[PDB]
Motif scaffolding. Sequence first.
Motif, PDB file in Angstrom:
ATOM      1  N   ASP A   1       0.869  -1.206   0.000  1.00  0.00           N
ATOM      2  CA  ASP A   1       0.000   0.000   0.000  1.00  0.00           C
ATOM      3  C   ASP A   1       0.903   1.252   0.000  1.00  0.00           C
ATOM      4  O   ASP A   1       1.882   1.297   0.781  1.00  0.00           O
ATOM      5  CB  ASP A   1      -0.813   0.044   1.310  1.00  0.00           C
ATOM      6  CG  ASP A   1      -1.938  -1.010   1.376  1.00  0.00           C
ATOM      7  OD1 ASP A   1      -2.300  -1.622   0.368  1.00  0.00           O
ATOM      8  OD2 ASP A   1      -2.400  -1.258   2.524  1.00  0.00           O
ATOM      9  N   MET A   2       0.570   2.228  -0.861  1.00  0.00           N
ATOM     10  CA  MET A   2       1.305   3.474  -0.913  1.00  0.00           C
ATOM     11  C   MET A   2       2.800   3.297  -1.178  1.00  0.00           C
ATOM     12  O   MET A   2       3.638   4.168  -0.884  1.00  0.00           O
ATOM     13  CB  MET A   2       1.054   4.282   0.348  1.00  0.00           C
ATOM     14  CG  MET A   2       0.883   5.759   0.122  1.00  0.00           C
ATOM     15  SD  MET A   2      -0.680   6.151  -0.745  1.00  0.00           S
ATOM     16  CE  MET A   2      -0.355   7.859  -1.026  1.00  0.00           C
ATOM     17  N   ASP A   3       3.101   2.138  -1.813  1.00  0.00           N
ATOM     18  CA  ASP A   3       4.526   1.733  -2.111  1.00  0.00           C
ATOM     19  C   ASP A   3       5.454   1.821  -0.883  1.00  0.00           C
ATOM     20  O   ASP A   3       6.638   2.141  -0.975  1.00  0.00           O
ATOM     21  CB  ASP A   3       5.048   2.426  -3.367  1.00  0.00           C
ATOM     22  CG  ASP A   3       4.267   2.062  -4.599  1.00  0.00           C
ATOM     23  OD1 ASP A   3       3.539   1.043  -4.537  1.00  0.00           O
ATOM     24  OD2 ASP A   3       4.378   2.810  -5.633  1.00  0.00           O
TER      25      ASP A   3
ATOM     26  N   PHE B   1      -2.705   8.985   4.265  1.00  0.00           N
ATOM     27  CA  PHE B   1      -1.542   9.014   3.376  1.00  0.00           C
ATOM     28  C   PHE B   1      -1.949   9.588   2.004  1.00  0.00           C
ATOM     29  O   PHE B   1      -1.256  10.434   1.442  1.00  0.00           O
ATOM     30  CB  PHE B   1      -0.940   7.603   3.164  1.00  0.00           C
ATOM     31  CG  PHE B   1      -0.564   6.853   4.404  1.00  0.00           C
ATOM     32  CD1 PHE B   1      -0.223   7.493   5.600  1.00  0.00           C
ATOM     33  CD2 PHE B   1      -0.549   5.440   4.361  1.00  0.00           C
ATOM     34  CE1 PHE B   1       0.085   6.789   6.709  1.00  0.00           C
ATOM     35  CE2 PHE B   1      -0.177   4.722   5.471  1.00  0.00           C
ATOM     36  CZ  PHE B   1       0.099   5.382   6.645  1.00  0.00           C
ATOM     37  N   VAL B   2      -3.081   9.160   1.458  1.00  0.00           N
ATOM     38  CA  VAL B   2      -3.579   9.659   0.203  1.00  0.00           C
ATOM     39  C   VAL B   2      -3.923  11.150   0.297  1.00  0.00           C
ATOM     40  O   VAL B   2      -3.573  11.988  -0.548  1.00  0.00           O
ATOM     41  CB  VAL B   2      -4.750   8.813  -0.379  1.00  0.00           C
ATOM     42  CG1 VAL B   2      -5.170   9.374  -1.747  1.00  0.00           C
ATOM     43  CG2 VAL B   2      -4.344   7.359  -0.515  1.00  0.00           C
TER      44      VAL B   2
ATOM     45  N   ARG C   1      -5.602  13.176  -6.111  1.00  0.00           N
ATOM     46  CA  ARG C   1      -6.237  11.832  -6.311  1.00  0.00           C
ATOM     47  C   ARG C   1      -7.196  11.516  -5.266  1.00  0.00           C
ATOM     48  O   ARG C   1      -7.934  10.509  -5.434  1.00  0.00           O
ATOM     49  CB  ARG C   1      -5.101  10.767  -6.323  1.00  0.00           C
ATOM     50  CG  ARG C   1      -4.261  10.878  -7.597  1.00  0.00           C
ATOM     51  CD  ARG C   1      -3.211   9.807  -7.726  1.00  0.00           C
ATOM     52  NE  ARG C   1      -2.592   9.825  -9.068  1.00  0.00           N
ATOM     53  CZ  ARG C   1      -1.505   9.143  -9.410  1.00  0.00           C
ATOM     54  NH1 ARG C   1      -0.881   8.373  -8.540  1.00  0.00           N
ATOM     55  NH2 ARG C   1      -1.032   9.253 -10.645  1.00  0.00           N
ATOM     56  N   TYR C   2      -7.253  12.286  -4.186  1.00  0.00           N
ATOM     57  CA  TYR C   2      -7.975  11.896  -2.963  1.00  0.00           C
ATOM     58  C   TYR C   2      -9.470  11.621  -3.161  1.00  0.00           C
ATOM     59  O   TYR C   2      -9.992  10.541  -2.792  1.00  0.00           O
ATOM     60  CB  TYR C   2      -7.673  12.851  -1.798  1.00  0.00           C
ATOM     61  CG  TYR C   2      -8.318  12.514  -0.500  1.00  0.00           C
ATOM     62  CD1 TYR C   2      -8.008  11.356   0.215  1.00  0.00           C
ATOM     63  CD2 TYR C   2      -9.291  13.363  -0.001  1.00  0.00           C
ATOM     64  CE1 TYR C   2      -8.670  11.070   1.395  1.00  0.00           C
ATOM     65  CE2 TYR C   2      -9.986  13.072   1.167  1.00  0.00           C
ATOM     66  CZ  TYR C   2      -9.668  11.919   1.835  1.00  0.00           C
ATOM     67  OH  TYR C   2     -10.306  11.746   3.059  1.00  0.00           O
TER      68      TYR C   2
ATOM     69  N   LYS D   1       4.254   9.664  -2.705  1.00  0.00           N
ATOM     70  CA  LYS D   1       3.656  10.699  -3.510  1.00  0.00           C
ATOM     71  C   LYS D   1       3.313  10.261  -4.933  1.00  0.00           C
ATOM     72  O   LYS D   1       2.383  10.797  -5.547  1.00  0.00           O
ATOM     73  CB  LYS D   1       4.645  11.867  -3.604  1.00  0.00           C
ATOM     74  CG  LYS D   1       4.919  12.589  -2.329  1.00  0.00           C
ATOM     75  CD  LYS D   1       6.013  13.681  -2.573  1.00  0.00           C
ATOM     76  CE  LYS D   1       6.261  14.476  -1.314  1.00  0.00           C
ATOM     77  NZ  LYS D   1       7.499  15.325  -1.341  1.00  0.00           N
ATOM     78  N   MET D   2       4.046   9.306  -5.464  1.00  0.00           N
ATOM     79  CA  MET D   2       3.907   8.827  -6.847  1.00  0.00           C
ATOM     80  C   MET D   2       3.171   7.511  -6.951  1.00  0.00           C
ATOM     81  O   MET D   2       2.890   7.059  -8.087  1.00  0.00           O
ATOM     82  CB  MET D   2       5.321   8.614  -7.457  1.00  0.00           C
ATOM     83  CG  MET D   2       6.122   9.867  -7.594  1.00  0.00           C
ATOM     84  SD  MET D   2       7.738   9.578  -8.352  1.00  0.00           S
ATOM     85  CE  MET D   2       8.744   8.329  -7.457  1.00  0.00           C
TER      86      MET D   2
END
Length: 331
Positions: free
Chosen positions: A185-187, A314-315, A322-323, A295-296
């Motif tokens: 998740d979220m890299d 985090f998003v 993108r949220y 962020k990416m």
Amino acid sequence: AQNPNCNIMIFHPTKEEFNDFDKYIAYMESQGAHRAGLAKIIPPKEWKARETYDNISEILIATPLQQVASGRAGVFTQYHKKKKAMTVGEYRHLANSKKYQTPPHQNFEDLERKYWKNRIYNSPIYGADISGSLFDENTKQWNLGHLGTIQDLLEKECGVVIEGVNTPYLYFGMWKTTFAWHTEDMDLYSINYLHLGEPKTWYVVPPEHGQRLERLARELFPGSSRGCGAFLRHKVALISPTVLKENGIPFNRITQEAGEFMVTFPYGYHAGFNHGFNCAEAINFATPRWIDYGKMASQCSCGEARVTFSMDAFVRILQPERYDLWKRGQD
Ligand SMILES: O=C(O)CNC(=O)C(=O)O
Ligand SMILES: [Mg+2]
Ligand code: NI
Ligand SMILES: [Zn+2]
């Protein structure tokens, strides 16, 4: 540049080097470990996670998952069919039954061959994603229940205080249980400790080459790709090493044994399978170098990926554009 071929590195810290977790991660990166996407850490001989595993049988697996495959031997998806609750002692007996037990084999390579040949013809049962910890509270080094939290890292780096918590998860596996190709998740990073039992084989794509895997996946799973621009976040697709080699995708493989840690690095795609009854513990974590990957990070907004409470912030903070669309996917 260190580790330019992106090989998986193996580390043997001393007991003194095992004290400061953040410092040792940064050390491994100084030697190029992150370029592989995956590293193994063998704890010093003096260390232990807990005294014994003799009293774990009454842990509950509330929703065991039967992993049913569709496709061809080297290119398949899996769906998770929910089964009735069972204890760890009940699950261990099931894993060791004639229907589910590991077959006779010569060595890890022979077992790997058998996995890729035969996985799709069986539906093993996985106890995954169980909140909890098997580290003794008195274990002070590399205790996956006592790490610095990702919310505290974001606050230290970026100054923004956010809601959310970060706790570990237990995995009870059997022969052929399978983790599909994904990044975190979220890299995020992940760390995984194999507490007991039979090994886990991993496959990994270097972060610098992750878009090559994504492009192959869109070719191999074309309906899924049309449904969602980040469908590997669904954690359902498998591609064998033979298929990856046929399509020129850079990857590496390694087998983790009981008592070993593995660390996955931001945007390091990984997949794998269990050799027999085992128990692992894993958690996500962050470092300063993660922030740019967060962020990416791609996101699934189709509704399939559905994730924890704590990914919201985090998003919201790292990906405000993108949220709104991502949150619609969550609701
Ligand atoms: O062990 C598993 O089933 C899957 N684990 C991971 O993807 C991890 O630790 O990142
Ligand atoms: Mg118990
Ligand atoms: Ni993972
Ligand atoms: Zn999706």
